[PDB]
Structure 1
Amino acid sequence: MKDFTTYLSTAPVIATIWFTFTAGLLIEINRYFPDPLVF
């Protein structure tokens, strides 16, 4: 399990998870707050 977690801690896996989280957050924000142009 330690080796598997270390593999999950590698740069491509971490980048994939982080970008999926960031993209999901932005998509959900644009979904609940459609068409945001100004503050």
Structure 2
Amino acid sequence: MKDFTTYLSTAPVIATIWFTFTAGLLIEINRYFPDPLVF
């Protein structure tokens, strides 16, 4: 399990998870707050 977690801690896996989280957050924000142009 330690080796598997270390593999999950590698740069491509971490980048994939982080970008999926960031993209999901932005998509959900644009979904609940459609068409945001100004503050």
- The TM-score bracket by the shorter chain reads over 0.9
Sequence identity, in percent? Answer: 100
Secondary structure, counterpart of 1:30 in structure 2? helix
How many pairs does the alignment contain?
39
Unaligned runs of 5+ in 2: none
Shift in Å at residue 14 of structure 1?
0.0
Give me the TM-score of the superposition, normalised by structure 2.
Answer: 1.00
Divergent runs of 4+, >4 A:
none
- After superposition, the CA RMSD in angstroms is 0.0
Give me the TM-score of the superposition, normalised by structure 1.
Answer: 1.00
Q: For each residue in 1:3-37, what CA deviation from the matched residue of structure 2 results, as whole angstroms up to 9, or x when unmatched?
A: 00000000000000000000000000000000000
